[PDB]
Amino acid sequence: KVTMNDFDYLKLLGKGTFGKVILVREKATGRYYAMKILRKEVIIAKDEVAHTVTESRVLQNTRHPFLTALKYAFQTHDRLCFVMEYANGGELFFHLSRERVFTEERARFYGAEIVSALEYLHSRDVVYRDIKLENLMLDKDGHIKITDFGLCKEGISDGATMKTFCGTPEYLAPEVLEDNDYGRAVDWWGLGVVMYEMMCGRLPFYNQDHERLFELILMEEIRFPRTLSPEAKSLLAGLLKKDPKQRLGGGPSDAKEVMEHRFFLSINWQDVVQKKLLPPFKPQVTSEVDTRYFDDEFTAQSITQEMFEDFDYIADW
């Protein structure tokens, strides 16, 4: 069994309604983790129970270098706690806010890792449903890790459908803004939006008014910069095709149509997963406790029976 007091609470990485995320150090081992700490009473009050429970079930039945790994899940009387591996490199949202726009080659590196992951997830009958720069993190070695699995759907294989209107407004596939059900293609739309942010330096469609933002995703055609490579333009036009059946990775082969596009001609898909590629960017951290790739906003602060049945957890690794 494991308890809140097996951990040293070192730095605050995030904070919101549902709780905090803290860099912590397991006292008995020395090894550093990110701990997601959530108030049970706020989770229950805002109908986010299933999501939390899905997140733990998903995180429990997944094994992949580009998906974040759960070491410990536990609860106290008023809290739920996930102890997952620490992403030293911060969010892509952080890096891309700084650089503004990545090179095609770098975009391509990250794009491959996301694709390999969505491949894995789709092979497990999971549809991720929340691809965004915020959910994409970088480990110590410079590799992507998907964080946050609350919005996933499970047991969707081949052409199974889903109904829940969910995810992130800016990142929503057109078919999810149409009434009725939708398939796993939505993940590829998602990839299309992040690759575009990485390459064209802005969101493909944006309006603070959500009514307009949806009129945009449904009706408007993406523009591309003039000197963006033709194979990049091709990839993006394919992933941001509005009709899912005509979208790249929207056919019966799924991730394979995306792997066999000529944007990725130089990528060896056997050796992406095996991690034989020197990443194009190494986070530049001095100590283990350095949080220069998270916001001063959070890091500068110092620190303090039915429903949750399938939650507690201890990893064998």
């Binding site: 915020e134 946050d148 829940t164 995810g167 992130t168 800016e170 802005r202 969101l203 944006y206």
Partner: peptide, 10 residues
């Protein structure tokens, strides 16, 4: 830049 986004679910 661009502001931080927030996940929803109806």
């Amino acid at each position: 830049g661009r502001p931080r986004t927030t996940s929803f679910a109806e």
